[PDB]
Paper text:
The carbonic anhydrase (CA) family (CA, EC 4.2.1.1), consisting of twelve catalytically active human isozymes, performs the catalysis of reversible hydration of CO2 into bicarbonate and acid protons. Since it has been observed that CAIX isozyme is highly overexpressed in numerous cancers, it has been postulated that compounds inhibiting CAIX may possess the anticancer activity and may be used in tumor treatment. Here we have designed a series of compounds, methyl 5-sulfamoyl-benzoates, which bear a primary sulfonamide group, a well-known marker of CA inhibitors, and determined their affinities for all twelve CA isozymes.
We compared the crystal structures of several compounds in two different CA isozymes. Figure 2B shows the binding mode of 3b and 3d in the active site of CAXII. The binding affinities and enthalpy changes to CAXII were almost identical (ΔGintr = −62.3 kJ/mol, ΔHintr = −48.0 kJ/mol (3b) vs. ΔGintr = −61.1 kJ/mol, ΔHintr = −50.1 kJ/mol (3d), Figure 2B). However, the binding affinities of 3b to CAIX and CAXII differed significantly and were 150 times stronger to CAIX than CAXII (Kd_intr = 0.030 nM or ΔGintr = −62.3 kJ/mol to CAXII and Kd_intr 0.20 pM or ΔGintr = −75.0 kJ/mol to CAIX). Again, the side chains interacting with 3b in CAIX and CAXII were different. They were more hydrophobic in CAIX (A203, L135, V131, L91, and Q67) and more hydrophilic in CAXII (N204, S135, V131, T91, and K68).
Author numbering:
A (entry chain B), B (entry chain A): 4 to 50, 50A, 51 to 54, 54A, 54B, 55 to 74, 78 to 81, 84 to 102, ...
């Protein structure tokens, strides 16, 4: 067990999950002193992101976030290996502090953050097996700003009702997962990092898009109030809020950018 | 052992120093949504700060920071008890990322931060004994930005060459410690917090002056490049940089200000 508040919190994670006190931890603050323009950061290709609205995909409350299972037929081109999707999920704040992005920009949090998680399908059979192995993982991060209502993000959020408690699951219609992406996906930050959650394996090629997407106040209120870390029948219920890790030390790293 | 990098780093502190995973952890980000003017916050007076240039004071590289031992008749007046000085030390970044303050203001890191550590001499013989006791410690924090040359900070930085390596020690003629303080010391943030290093005891009444001081990039650079964490004869020498804790989560809690 582990949480984002009090004894079992992120300062305690290392007690049980040693890579949590290891090198190359995410997330981090994106600021100009540690950015490095790199001409080898070519645009990524989003293959098989257009999911049929006639097909269903599983939304799950895992106690930590809400996650949507993705088919491995969907993948990234543009990296050293093929990276097949496994799932997406979100991190957010709370009604009183709607600033729960993991990555910050110049010390500022965004409202929230979407993570699209892929595994190295050329080396490993599944995300689990890739999880603690070199070149195992590749996450796309999308910074989320409070703004206009997002009909595309709502294809996830209109179902939060059915996954209020840890272990609950609802089938959700396919949609074009590229609609979750901001503009100029060719402008991104790139760096070597980790799971932002235990076991914090240092096995993740991070790609954080430069531009944020927008979701409304109401969407954030809904995401910040819908969900519990706890089973429906737990007598110590904990609201699923502030499910974000503090930015980490750079350990001599740079953040390579596709823009200058 | 404990460091600010690698296996023994701040995320691992909780293993041997459980308070580092506990309550009231410092440092924090000071942002308006958690600031409340409290009109009761009157100026502190600093008694005995004017150390005679007649008298010499020990400067130690302890492998975490440069530290200047201060005399105990040096003290804060204005608190609920008398708080006597034990030492001052600094935190800083690295030449490539010169943002090494512990506290941040609206997510911004300052160049460096000076801590003048006082203990409750009314109740406790020394700061060591005070350190795990309720209301044992009061620290004064000064935020440092790059700007004009600072002749009074130079009274410390002039001697850094005598304490390059860990365990090294130099005598510094006394000066007025009150010259290390910024403009309008009446303007400060006040909260209940912890030590920012192990054992992270939640025993510290924090006072962080509103206004930064300036030191020249030459002053700042000397500090960033002058010292090593390692003994003279350590075959693998480690530069002393980034000796600052990541800001902690600050939940359902307020920072008071003496300014509206
Ligand atoms: C609130 O945080 C999360 O719940 C979460 C966060 C991540 S993250 N932010 O990408 O590190 C992953 S990815 C990982 C899960 C375990 C095995 C490999 C895939 C999965 C999850 Cl389920
Ligand atoms: C770079 O960090 C340090 O070197 C440091 C930083 C602090 S701080 N930031 O004030 O917690 C203390 S506190 C001192 C109080 C007396 C007994 C324990 C150590 C001691 C030290 Cl040794
Ligand atoms: Zn995530
Ligand atoms: Zn300190």
């Amino acid at each position: 067990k582990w949480t984002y508040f009090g004894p079992d919190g992120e300062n305690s994670w290392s007690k049980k999950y040693p890579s949590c006190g290891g090198l190359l931890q995410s997330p981090i603050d994106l600021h100009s002193d540690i950015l490095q323009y790199d001409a080898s950061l070519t645009p990524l290709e989003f293959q098989g992101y257009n999911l049929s609205a006639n097909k269903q995909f599983l939304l799950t409350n895992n106690g930590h976030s809400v996650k949507l299972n993705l088919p491995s037929d969907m993948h990234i081109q543009g990296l050293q290996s093929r990276y097949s999707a496994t799932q997406l999920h979100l991190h957010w704040g709370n009604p009183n502090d709607p600033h729960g992005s993991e990555h910050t920009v110049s010390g500022q949090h965004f409202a929230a953050e979407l993570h699209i998680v892929h595994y190295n399908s050329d080396l490993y059979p599944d995300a689990s097996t890739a999880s603690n192995k070199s070149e195992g993982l590749a996450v796309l991060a999308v910074l989320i700003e409070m703004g206009s209502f997002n009909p595309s993000y709502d294809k996830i959020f209109s179902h939060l009702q059915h996954v209020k408690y840890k272990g609950q699951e609802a089938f959700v219609p396919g949609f074009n997962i590229e609609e979750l992406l901001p503009e100029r996906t060719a402008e991104y930050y790139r760096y070597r990092g980790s799971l932002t959650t235990p076991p914090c394996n240092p096995t993740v090629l991070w790609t954080v898009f430069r531009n944020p997407v927008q979701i409304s106040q109401e969407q954030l209120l809904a995401l910040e109030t819908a969900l519990y870390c706890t089973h429906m029948d737990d007598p110590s219920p904990r609201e699923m809020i502030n499910n974000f890790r503090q930015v980490q030390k750079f350990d001599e790293r740079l953040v390579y950018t596709s823009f200058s």
